[PDB]
Design a protein around this ligand. Structure first.
Ligand code: HEM
Ligand code: RTZ
Ligand code: RTZ
Ligand code: ZN
Ligand code: ZN
Ligand code: ZN
Length: 467
């Protein structure tokens, strides 16, 4: 068939000069309007095809799901100890090493969500610690980003290591700092050359520079995992994900085919921290910003909280089914926030057809999730913060098919259930105890995000006064 249309590639630079990596989302919307829902791009050495709109995204990730579940190879991961049997989950090539870990994480999260419901208890407890930290600001204006990062990070810590860290723990803070620096190493021209020409990794200066923060991150992680290994009681059922992994590691001793080994454990835990911290934290940061920019919505949320939960009792997941408006608001925060505009890249493992065009095997697929969440043909006013995008005239919560912030198909966010829990419990707990507002004498913060691959709220401060 015909290959997707797009800007004519430059002789050597290809379409690199046709893409603004500072505002890639805006740039891609421009290309979409010009070339259609499915367009091509030759970014450096990689042939790329961008998918816009729900139809294109689903046809690729769902209809042709078996052929689009792979990730583009990333040579530099060798630096982090990657191997055929240890690829973590996030960037693991489609195959058994990924599927065994995918199934393990999914079932493990599900299990920690049943019975005594450990996950919900850890989250509820963290929300209380978070509220107390907000109160310590005594009404003084502050940037809530740091605390949101710590609260969300502690939830992953609870899930993986069965513990939390005090907000002033040296090790915890170093870990968070390394995490934010590490995210940056996902961009840059250096990584682009090294991945295209892996032999350049033989030069110490370069190999030791591309992922210095991510390597240090893993090193800090090793220290924590080693301590956990000492406290693990194998005679009791696994209390957290690392214990379940260790138990599986023991059963796999002697099996060279297993993905349960020391090299993979550190990668899997690092992946959960990496994929689950900045996302959930940035979403909550958008949440509070939108609440001070739209006080009316905030009051309506607080009125539903008071009517369903009261001002004493801690919010519970059971309350969610009875708070359609708060659910609508949280969903609109994600839709409007659009924190992962271009999702995570996929790679075709077989020629496929999308919207009639031919997609050669080995093509890197970019899912423009932003084009789905902001589609003008689906949403009433995609560019406004409008809770009613998820409510009907009767006030019932309705979730359009276009709500795909976690993507779709076999590789769709495995943390979605936990993210939903964290967003509801952290948001409601905070709105239940505080009234948030923009600090006087300060300009109304912008609703425009700052793109750095991940889309964050423009820097802002706020006052949290007890209710
Ligand atoms: C508001 C929160 C979150 C958002 C918007 C988000 C979004 C996403 C997106 C867009 C992807 C890529 C899907 C694809 O490849 O097509 C992804 C993957 C993934 N997410 Fe999340 N995420 C969130 C939180 C979480 C959390 C809390 C965890 C961890 C417990 C996590 C775990 C992962 C993992 C491990 C993957 C890779 C799955 C695979 O390759 O099979 N995420 N997420
Ligand atoms: C703490 S550095 C950090 C922070 C946030 C993110 C990521 C890394 N990762 C990759 C996870 C990586 C962690 C080290 C072990 C190997 N695995 C692959 C990422 C990659 C591409 C899009 C989004 C993201 S979210
Ligand atoms: C892995 S998740 C992911 C998802 C979408 C984009 C990116 C990464 N990348 C660069 C990695 C890749 C993109 C295709 C061309 C070959 N290179 C290696 C990026 C970085 C900064 C601004 C925009 C983008 S688009
Ligand atoms: Zn434990
Ligand atoms: Zn209805
Ligand atoms: Zn209170």
């Amino acid at each position: 068939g015909k290959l997707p249309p797009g800007p004519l590639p430059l002789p050597g630079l290809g379409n690199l000069l046709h893409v603004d990596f500072q505002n890639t989302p805006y740039c891609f919307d421009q290309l979409r309007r010009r070339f259609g829902d499915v367009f091509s791009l030759q970014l450096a050495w990689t042939p790329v095809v961008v998918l816009n709109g729900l139809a294109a995204v689903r046809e690729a990730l769902v209809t042709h799901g078996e052929d689009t579940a792979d990730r583009p190879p990333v040579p530099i991961t060798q630096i982090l100890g990657f191997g055929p049997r240890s690829q973590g989950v996030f960037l693991a090539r489609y195959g058994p090493a990924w599927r065994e870990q995918r199934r393990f994480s999914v079932s493990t999260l599900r299990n920690l969500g049943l019975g005594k419901k450990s996950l919900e208890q850890w989250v509820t407890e963290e929300a209380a610690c978070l509220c107390a930290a907000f109160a310590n600001h005594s009404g003084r204006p502050f940037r809530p980003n740091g605390l949101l990062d710590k609260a969300v990070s502690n939830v992953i810590a609870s899930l993986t290591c069965g513990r939390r860290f005090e907000y002033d723990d040296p090790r915890f803070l170093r870990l968070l700092d390394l995490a934010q620096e590490g995210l940056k190493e996902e961009s840059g021209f250096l990584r682009e050359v090294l991945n295209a020409v892996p032999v350049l990794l033989h030069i110490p200066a370069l190999a030791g520079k591309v992922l210095r923060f991510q390597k240090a991150f893993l090193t800090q992680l090793d220290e924590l995992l080693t301590e956990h290994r000492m406290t693990w009681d194998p005679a009791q059922p696994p209390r957290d994900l690392t214990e379940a992994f260790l138990a599986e590691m023991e059963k796999a001793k002697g099996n060279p085919e297993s993905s349960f080994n020391d090299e993979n454990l550190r990668i899997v835990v690092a992946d959960l921290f990496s994929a689950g911290m900045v996302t959930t934290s940035t979403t909550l940061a958008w949440g509070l910003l939108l609440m001070i920019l739209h006080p009316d919505v905030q009051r309506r949320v607080q009125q539903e909280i008071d009517d369903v939960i009261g001002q004493v009792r801690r919010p519970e997941m059971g309350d969610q089914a009875h708070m359609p408006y708060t659910t609508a608001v949280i969903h609109e925060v994600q839709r409007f926030g659009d924190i992962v505009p271009l999702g995570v890249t996929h790679m075709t493992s077989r020629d496929i057809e999308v919207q009639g065009f031919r997609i050669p095997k080995g093509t890197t697929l970019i899912t423009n999730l932003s084009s789905v969440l902001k589609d003008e043909a689906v949403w009433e006013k995609p560019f406004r913060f409008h809770p009613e995008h998820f409510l009907d005239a009767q006030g019932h919560f309705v979730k359009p098919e276009a709500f795909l912030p976690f993507s779709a198909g076999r590789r769709a966010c495995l943390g979605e259930p936990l993210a939903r829990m964290e967003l509801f419990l952290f948001f409601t707990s905070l709105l239940q105890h505080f009234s948030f507002s923009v600090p006087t004498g300060q300009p109304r913060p912008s609703h425009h995000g700052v793109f750095a691959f991940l889309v964050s709220p423009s820097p802002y401060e706020l006052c949290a006064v007890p209710r």
